[PDB]
Amino acid sequence: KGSVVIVGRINLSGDTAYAQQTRGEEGCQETSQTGRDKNQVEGEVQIVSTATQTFLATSINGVLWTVYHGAGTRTIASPKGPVTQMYTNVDKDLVGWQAPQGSRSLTPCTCGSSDLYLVTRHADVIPVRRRGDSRGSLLSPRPISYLKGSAGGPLLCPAGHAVGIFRAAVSTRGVAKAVDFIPVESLETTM
Ligand SMILES: C=C[C@@H]1C[C@]1(NC(=O)[C@@H]1C[C@@H]2CN1C(=O)[C@H](C(C)(C)C)NC(=O)O[C@@H]1C[C@H]1CCCCCc1nc3ccc(OC)cc3nc1O2)C(=O)NS(=O)(=O)C1CC1
Numbered sequence: 319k320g321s322v323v324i325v326g327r328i329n330l331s332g333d334t335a336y337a338q339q340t341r342g343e344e345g346c347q348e349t350s351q352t353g354r355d356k357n358q359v360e361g362e363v364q365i366v367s368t369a370t371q372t373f374l375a376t377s378i379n380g381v382l383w384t385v386y387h388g389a390g391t392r393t394i395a396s397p398k399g400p401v402t403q404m405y406t407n408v409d410k411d412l413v414g415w416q417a418p419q420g421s422r423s424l425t426p427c428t429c430g431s432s433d434l435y436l437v438t439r440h441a442d443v444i445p446v447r448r449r450g451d452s453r454g455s456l457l458s459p460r461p462i463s464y465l466k467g468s469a470g471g472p473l474l475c476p477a478g479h480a481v482g483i484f485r486a487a488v489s490t491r492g493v494a495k496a497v498d499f500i501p502v503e504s505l506e507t508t509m
């Protein structure tokens with residue numbers, strides 16, 4: 319099993335929400351084996367890939383977070399070498415590494431706003447309302463297809479702070495009504 323390789327970012331740089339591929343299939347395959355990745359990394363939200371899976375990962379106060387169901391127990395490739403997991407919790411579906419060289423980090427939310435925004439692998443910013451600790455209702459029903467591959471991605475409050483990490487979609491008859499996420503509180507207890 320190779321290392322997770324950062325293959326793009328979801329950009330909230332300026333006044334538009336958009337994804338950028340920064341590596342291709344073959345070169346990803348090459349980098350996973352060794353774990354040595356020179357590539358220019360930027361930003362808070364990374365697109366990350368394994369041999370079979372592509373998903374998201376979000377840096378929040380110096381730690382890159384994602385889902386175990388995506389990342390398994392794998393290292394993540396870095397300029398120096400494979401980077402071992404800092405945090406690992408299979409029940410929470412959570413893994414964390416040190417935040418990558420080049421990254422920015424989001425700040426945990428302190429607002430307690432319930433208006434939230436899920437950022438997807440397609441670079442859509444989808445509005446969500448807080449349902450409670452770890453659930454949030456989409457204002458606009460989507461098929462599961464649409465959200466698939468956006469695990470590891472942030473739910474942001476209106477200040478652009480992180481509320482949590484997208485974990486799963488609450489679906490009936492193929493339609494996501496709500497989403498499940500790992501709250502920052504739970505990260506900050508995991509830390
Ligand atoms: C729509 C996008 C959605 C974010 C995505 N997540 C999933 O697909 C998860 C993974 C798996 C099933 N998922 C679901 O979302 C299901 C599904 C019907 C399939 C939508 N929904 C669901 O259970 O609803 C129940 C209320 C919630 C209860 C919570 C479920 C538990 C979460 C979960 N935890 C663990 C911990 C450890 C494991 O060890 C290997 C494995 C796990 N697997 C898990 O669920 C995603 O995009 N992934 S991804 O990016 O495509 C892939 C590359 C990584």
Ligand SMILES: [Zn+2]
Nearest residue numbers: 427428429475
């Ligand atoms: Zn906030």
